[PDB]
Structure formats: structure tokens, C-alpha cells
Paper text:
Yellow fever virus (YFV) is a re-emerging flavivirus that causes severe hepatic disease and mortality in humans. Crystallographic studies have resolved the structure of the YFV E protein and shown that its domain architecture is similar to related flaviviruses, with three N-terminal ectodomains, known as domains I (DI), II (DII) and III (DIII) and a stem anchor region known as the transmembrane domain (TM). Here we use a chimeric virus platform to resolve the first high resolution cryo-EM structures of YFV. Stark differences in particle morphology and homogeneity are observed between vaccine and virulent strains of YFV, and these are found to have significant implications on antibody recognition and neutralisation.
Introduction of R380 into bYFVES504 also resulted in more homogenous virions, allowing for its ASU to be resolved to a high resolution. The symmetry expanded local reconstruction method was used to resolve the ASU of bYFVES504 T380R to an initial resolution of 3.2 Å. To help elucidate all particle stabilising interactions that might be mediated by T380R, the symmetry expanded map was further refined after a focussed 3D classification around the previously ill-defined icosahedral three-fold axis. This resulted in two final maps with the three-fold axis E protein in two discrete states, which we designated up and down. While the global resolution of these maps are similar to the previous, the three-fold axis E protein is well resolved in the down map, allowing accurate modelling of the E protein in all three positions. Residue R380, which is located on a non-surface exposed loop of E-DIII, makes contacts with neighbouring E proteins at three unique inter-raft interfaces. The five-fold axis E protein R380 residue makes two intermolecular bonds with the backbone carbonyl groups of D382 and R384 and the two-fold axis E protein R380 residue forms a salt bridge with E87. In the down conformation, the three-fold axis E protein R380 residue makes a bond with the side chain hydroxyl of T133, while this contact is not observed in the up position. The atomic model of the bYFVES504 T380R ASU was then compared with the atomic model of the bYFVES504/DIII17D ASU and was found to be highly similar (rigid body whole ASU Cα RMSD: 0.82 Å). Instead, we propose that the three inter-raft interactions mediated by R380 act together to lock the smooth mature virion structure, and that this conformational stabilisation propagates down to the dimer level.
Author numbering:
A (entry chain A), B (entry chain B), C (entry chain C): 1 to 391
The structure:
Amino acid sequence: AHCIGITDRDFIEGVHGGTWVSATLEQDKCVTVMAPDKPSLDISLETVAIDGPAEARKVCYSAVLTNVKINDKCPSTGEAHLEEENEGDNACKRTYSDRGWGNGCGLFGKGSIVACAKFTCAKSMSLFEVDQTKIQYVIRAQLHVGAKQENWNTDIKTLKFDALSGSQEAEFTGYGRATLECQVQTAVDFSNSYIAEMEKESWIVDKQWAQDLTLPWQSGSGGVWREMHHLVEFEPPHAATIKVLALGNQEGSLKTALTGAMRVTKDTNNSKLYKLHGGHVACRVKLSALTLKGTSYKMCTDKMSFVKNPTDTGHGTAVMQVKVPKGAPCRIPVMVADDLTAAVNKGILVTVNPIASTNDDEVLIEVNPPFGDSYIIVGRGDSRLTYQWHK
Amino acid sequence: AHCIGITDRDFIEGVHGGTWVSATLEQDKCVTVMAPDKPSLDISLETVAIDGPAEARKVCYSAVLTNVKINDKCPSTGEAHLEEENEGDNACKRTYSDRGWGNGCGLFGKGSIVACAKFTCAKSMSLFEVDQTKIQYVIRAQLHVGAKQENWNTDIKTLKFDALSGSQEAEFTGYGRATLECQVQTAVDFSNSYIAEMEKESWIVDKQWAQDLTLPWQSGSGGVWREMHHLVEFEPPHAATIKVLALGNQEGSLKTALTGAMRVTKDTNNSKLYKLHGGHVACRVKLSALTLKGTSYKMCTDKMSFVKNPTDTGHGTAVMQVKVPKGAPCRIPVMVADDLTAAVNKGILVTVNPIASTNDDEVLIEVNPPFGDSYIIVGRGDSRLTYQWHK
Amino acid sequence: AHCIGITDRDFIEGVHGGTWVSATLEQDKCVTVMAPDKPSLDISLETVAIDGPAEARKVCYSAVLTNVKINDKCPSTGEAHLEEENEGDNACKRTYSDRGWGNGCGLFGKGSIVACAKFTCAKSMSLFEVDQTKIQYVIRAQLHVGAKQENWNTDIKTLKFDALSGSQEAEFTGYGRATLECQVQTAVDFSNSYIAEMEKESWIVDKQWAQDLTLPWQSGSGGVWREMHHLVEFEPPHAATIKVLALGNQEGSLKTALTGAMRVTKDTNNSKLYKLHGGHVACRVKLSALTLKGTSYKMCTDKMSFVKNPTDTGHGTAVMQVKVPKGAPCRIPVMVADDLTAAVNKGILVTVNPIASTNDDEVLIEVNPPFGDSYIIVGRGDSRLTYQWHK
């Protein structure tokens, strides 16, 4: 019952017959869906992911200007030039200096200076495109067979999806089968956004934001960086010198903007998987094909005992564990009542027909008792167990 | 006259006699000072040097965070512990986590969790206290003797104003002496500030700002880093685990905050001299002890020549060089006239009395011609040089 | 019949259908359960306990500051540090002192000073976290066999329970057996608390209160104390000196807060056991398997005598002890009548069928006389003991 452990649990109540029940899931939340006689079904998300998204940009946030040269010409001697100015790895600026006799010229007009510097990205973001059609989904499903928690880790059923895959069927030994539609494409519309990756961290952010970044960037595998001035200061030109300086590591400013984004976690082993949080889904549940097991076994009579008392899940339910020490595969009766007379059950039972699978067996039960005080009763008979519960 | 070569130049005229004159000097700029019968003096502020600061703080802008450890305890089994928390260099944080029957406990309350990791400073900024007793103001002074531009740097006098040398005497060969008072005590407000130094760039910064930085720091002599929570962030705990992530390198953000501070350049030679950019100082000039070297001389009447023609420095003054190949102890007649008949002189000479003193002497002359059309006339008789001018 | 010894006694009565009777047992009170046709039961809550709580915090109420070191620096020579400041068992404070030539400092102004002292707890309050699942309790049961007060502790049955021993059976020789089924406690009053222990005094305290105490604390594994500044007082600096003094022993203030808490007591022999006062336990009693020992026996006729004359219990009942010196394997006829025509036993007998069993047996009888005047009567004609009793 994986749904016991997730704080955001929702309960959905259904109807009999050949019918579907609607549900919606979020990556941190779980639904228990219940229906008049079907064993109740737990459903949660497990991942939303893209596999091998395609490179779309690199954006540079630290650069080294490895060498620099200047050319300068007197005010009447025309425009200055440097052969580096036409070579793609060099950031170059043209501007006019204050020439004169003090600086080695015959005339006092404005002179011409060019400054060029060899660029090199030290560290850069990789921006990856997400094809909204290629996203992958995984759903967890369970029925309350009444298994102990030491068993959940194997009983849990994993339903894998992609945005193109159809409704899928789950098989539970004995209880039969279910089918879920999950129309994921109506939930997530992450087109017009893309994955921004940085060393050991990643985000998803809007493309129009990223294109508008005032940082130098590269259009693909190799080739020149395209807006180099966004990382290079050229000082106001002196007589024949322009000090050029790199603007320093912009990792911290870039992270500051990303703080609002939905996070992305790179898979530790299937290296090219990128798990994408926040994305929800809508699903509809074919409850009709489930069945209870063992409806026709005998009801218990043995002197049962608690393995753990009822405890408040915070979902409003009480979860409890019981054992039949020396019985056949008997049905374990349970009810909630206003008084020891117990003339009727007055509560809702999540586990619908708990059965001892073996002669020594231990079983889990969960109940949703009404408001106020009520007596939880298990083992209707002379040798009743009870716990005086309160909301 | 080095101020022919500085693009921001002001003119000041003393009432009479060189009695007492005032100026404000700013690092980019120069003042030319005139008086009715005394040689003109060029004054400018060369540098404002601060000598031998002492360290106050280092502020770390990029921490590498290592050897993370976590400990967590079941939701009603007391509170967490790590030995690493005894050590001042681990940035440990303590909180609570959702727990439940599927996550290692009998209860559904909140389990205490604590996580520690070692904060190592990869790069840090040095803040220095500035000794306001050790500020040196350097003024350059030279006369308009008529020296050619190759010689200006050997004619210039350099005067240094520490807090004690409040009045200084400029001496010139033959032209007498001039006294400068520079009011260092009212020039800057250093006491409430620190030198901030990053690698090969430095700033002078307000002390309140430097201390109110939300960024982790260490005492000048070393020891412990005091405010590590400003760079170490802890993501909200999953059931059994908490991930700690270092915030990025803040260099670009720190420089962005510094976009308003006055830059300071460290000396290549004296490893503890710091030269402030953009300072100013109020100064006063006593001209009364200057003399004009050659008022006793004869007039020229020989075949003079232009080594450099009058050229238009943007100050609106015409600068020329005349060579006097014959009569040596002689004065050059210069006038600017509205017509070649030379009926009146319409230009102030800045070189107040251009004397030759060898049979080959080359004398720079600067004239302030009137608005409209005029003739710069140098010489007498038939050997005159006459040059047309226009504002 | 130990209900006699407990002042806060309630009577509860059965109905001839033999239904379970439910009763509320509270730590100072006692209950006599009377059946219509079967012997009456003393039932009373003896203890409620936790066996070995979980150690959660020690909080310090008396402290000593065993070693003190101070460091001071001049106003323009940086900021002071100490090796102790890196070392976790030192409490530390940083501030500034007014320096000047009067204390060896060359510049007048505020100078940084820092002081550190070794914290050491002399007495700490232990706080143990209570866990409802570990609560234990004990009920005492005793039928009104008629035994001497001197024989009660030999004859009472002590019934132990825990959260999982669902029901217990009490066996009374000859009279048969009864079974109790119980809530481990109804006492939700203990929720969200700690057991607080000082030397030989203990209390139950709200978790919020205990954690918000302005006193330094540590986790039970032996950490280092987390808020030492609550007990170190730092004198304002004077030259190079700070005096640090320990704020005094807080035992009385902490006790003054604790006066409202429910008391907790520690066992003398099994020191992990804390007896938690003030609880409510609810139980059901199965009366059906009780029986009356001697209903077939002869009815007394030899002269009885009073060992203790009838006396007022304060519960409205009267108690006597009677001696049967001959013929003793025989029923003692006791009745309360309106007058010596002895028409009917207008009273209710709590000792439902007093039998003597040995040739000099002495038997206690408890009667509930009617309102108004009455005669207590025991025996048969010409041999009746009688005693006037008025409400």
C-alpha cells in the first residue's frame, strides 16, 4: 500500500458496474480510489522524463581573453586595422582616441583605435530541446491485499508509458485486472521551454527568456561564439592603449535567475535520462475488472491478536496489523461502531475482505472511522478485539 | 606646457601681480594659470597614492563543499546527532522530516534530521583598512618657458603633498619660484571605507556595505569562516535524505555591485602602494616670486622659420614652433591681427614672452586668437611669417 | 475488600443478562463491581508507567566557565580572532572597545575584541520522549471473599498489562475466574510531551515548552551544547579586558515553571520504570465465570461474636468482623431490617454470601444499610447479634 507513505493522499469514491472513474496525479501525491465492491486501488506517479534531448544552444558564463593587441592611427591617417579583426575567435572593438602632440601626432583631432582579444569559453550551460511528444511517464499501482510493509517493495506494479502509448492493463494475481487511461498530453505542454543544464545541476526554463539572455552563446557543435561583447569590457581608450578585461564568472547571477524554475535531475545511471518534476497527469480507472479474493471462505473464530495497534496516518485513516495464530484461511471480520453493541458498522473499510493466506498469517487493515469517538472492532465474536478510537 | 596635450583644460587669471590664486585639480584635467606680467604655470594632479594598508576581512565568493554527512532519527526516538557539528568548519543544518510506517518507524510523526559538510574557500576578496595618515598627493607643475615637447618631461617638477608637507616650493631655472598649497585634509573621506581587492582589480568600498554583504567571511588573520549559511543551501528533506548544494561563484554579482565604486590600481613595483583613480584636491598658487627670463633682451629682426605650423588644439589656442637662426639673445614678436596692417593686437599670448637664447633655439609659442578671421604674425619687416586663422 | 481502604469509591451494578460491565478506573479512585447473583469485585488502577523512555535532550540549569581567554586589536589593525573560536566547546562573543593612548594603542577609536570561555554543565535536566505504544499499566482485582484486612495483600491478584496484552484472566480459588479487557489508556492527556527529570524529581511537560526553554541543550548522544549564550554573561569591554560570568543556577526558576506539571515518579528497584500519574484506564469486566462458594452449606446457629463492631466507612456502607466459634462450616445469615420483626433484608449485602470455613474463622461483612433507621442483624433467634445503624 504505497499510498500510506505519501502525505498528499486523495480519496476518490466510485460506482458499480462497467464504469470508469476519473483521477489526476502529481509527482508528489497519491490517490486511493474506492468503489462499492471492488478492492480499492492505489495510484501514484514515479517519474516524468525525457531521454536524450537534442542540443540547441550553449551559453557561456566564464571566459578567458588569452591575448590582446592594439592598432592606432593619427587623426588624419585614417582608420586603423588588425588582421585579427576578421578571425572568428577574436572579440574586437573600434573606437576613437584623443590624439595630439603629447601623444606623438602632428594634429589634435580624434584618432582611431582597434582592440582585439582571443576569446575562450571556460564553462558554459548546455541548453537541450524537449520534444513534447517524446516525454516518458511511469505510474505505480497497488491493491490493498493486506500485505505487510516489508512486502510492498515487491507487490508494487510499475506501468510504463510514453506520450504515444495507449491505456494499459495491470494484472493482480487472484484479484483480476485493471486498466488505466492516462492522457498525459493534456497535462503537460512544456513546448516553448527547454532544459538548461549546468555542471551537476539542471532546470527547465522558457525559450524566449533564454534567447533574451545577455550572455554570449554558441549555435551548435563548434563554430564561433555569437555575442562575445556581453562578457568583455573595453575601457575608454587612452592615447594608444585600451585595457580589455573579462567580466568574471557569471555562474552566481545565472543561478539567481533560475531559482524560480522547475527542477530537472539527471539520472545517476541511465545517464542520458533527464527526470522532470512538477508535471501532472489525468487518468481514468477501469475498476470494473477487479474482483475480491476468497469471498466464500469461512469467517474467523480463533483468538486473534494485534501485531500493531491502530495508528493515525494523518489521512484520516487508521492502519492496523493483526494475526490469526492457528486458523484455516479464514476471513478476518472488522467493523467500526458507536458502541460495544456494534449493532451496525458505521465506518468505511479500505481493506475490503482481509484473509489469512496461511495458518500463521499476519495481515494489514486500514479503516476510515467517523468523526467523534468510535470503537474499532476486529474479530466479531466472543473473543473480540477493540480499540477506542477518536478522530 | 603639458596641458597642451590634456583634453580637459581650464584657464584661470590672477587679478594682478600674481598676488594669490586658487584652483581645483582633478585627475583627468589640468589648469593653466595666467597673470598680467608673469610666466604661465601648468598644474595637474598626477596620482593619489595610499601606502601600506592592513587586512581587515576576507570575503569568500566561491566555496567548494565536501564530504557531506547525514544522520536521521525515527519520528519519536529523540533528536539527531553528528560529531562533525563540534567542528567550526562544517556548515551543519538541523531540521525535521516526514516519516511513517513505510519508512522505518512505528509512528507517523516527524523525524529529526541533521546534515554537515566542510566549507572550503576556493576564492576570496581582501578588504583593507586605509591609513589616512599615509595619503600622498602628487602634483605636476611646469612653466610655459617655450620648451619643445621632447623636453616637457624633463622640465616638469613633481611635488608630493603628504599630510605634513602642506606647502611646497616649485623652483625653475631663471624664472624664479612658485609656492603651492594643496588642501589634502578636505580632499577625500577615506575613514569610512576599505580597499576591496580581487585578483588584479580593486575598489574603495563603504565599510557598512562591505560588512552588510550577505556573503561568508573570515577575520583578517585567518581562523574561522563565520557566516557559511550564505553560500550553502539545503533542499527540503525527503524521508531519509537531505541534499546540500553549493551556491555558485558570485564573482560576477559582486563586481556588479561594485559598478559604482572608485577604482584603485595596485603598483607594479612597491607591492603596497595603491593609486586611487578620480580624486581631486583644492590648491592655491603664489605667483609673486616668478619672473620673466628675458624682458631685458632685444627684439628679433631676422629670418625666422616655422618648424611646426600653428595647429588647433581643441582649447582654441594655436601652438607653433619658431626657429631663430640668427640673433640669439632676442625676443620674438608675436601678434594676432585682423589685417596684415597689424593695427591692433587681438590675441592673448599664453607663452607670455617668447625669448630665444641660442642661435638655433626652437621655441614653442601658444596664442589665443580671436573669433573670426585673423592673421598670426610672427617677426618684423620683410622676413615676417604670416598665417591665416579661423576661430 | 480493599475498596474499603480507598476513599474515592464508586459502586457499579450488573443486570441479570450477564452482559459485560464497563468501568472507569482512575489512579486515585477505586470501583466495587456488584453482580446481581455473584460475588462483588474490587477493581482499581495501581500504576501507569513507561519502561525505559528514549533519551532526547539534556538541558543545562547550572553551568561553570572553567577557562577564559581574550584577544584585542587596535582600531586600524584589523579584526581579532582566537583559536578557541574554531573549537566547539567554547562560548564566544565579539564586540569593540574604545582604545587610545591610555591603553597602549596608537590611534584613538573603537577596536575589535573577542572573548571565549569553556562551557561545562554541572547539572542538566534530562528530557525523555514518551511513546504511547510503550505505556504499561497494572490493575488490582479482589473479590469480597470476606477475608481479614490483614490478609488482603496475600490474596489480591495483581494483573499486568501492556499495549498488546489484549485481555487477562483473574482466577480466584473456588469462586472461579473473571476476565478484564481494557484500553491501555484512555489518557490522551499525555500526548506531545516529555518526561522531565531533575535529581529525584520528575514532571511531564509540553514539547513546545521544553524546546523553547531559553537554556542551553544537547541531544542524548552527547553533542556539544547548542545555545550557550543563555548562561554566559559578557561584561562590556574595558581596555583589553572582558569579564565573563556564569548566569546563576536556574533550578528554582525551572521548578517554578514545572509546578503545574503532572508528577512522575521513578521506581526504586527497576530504575528505568517511570510511573506516570494522572491517567484514565477504561475496562470491561466479565462477571459470568464467577461463583458463590458455599450456597449449599448449613446456616449458622451457634452464638457468634463481634471482633470489630460495625463501623462507618464513609461510602455509606458499614463494616463489621464476626467470629464463628463453633459449627463453623456454615453460612452467616446477615440482614438489615426496619425493626426486630425482621421482615426483610431491606439492605444490600456487598459480601453477598458470607461463609465461615474453619472452626474458629473470623469473617468480614460489608452492608449497605437503607436510609433512615435500621437494625443490622446477624444470626438466628435467641442468638442474634444486633446493632442500631442510622443512614
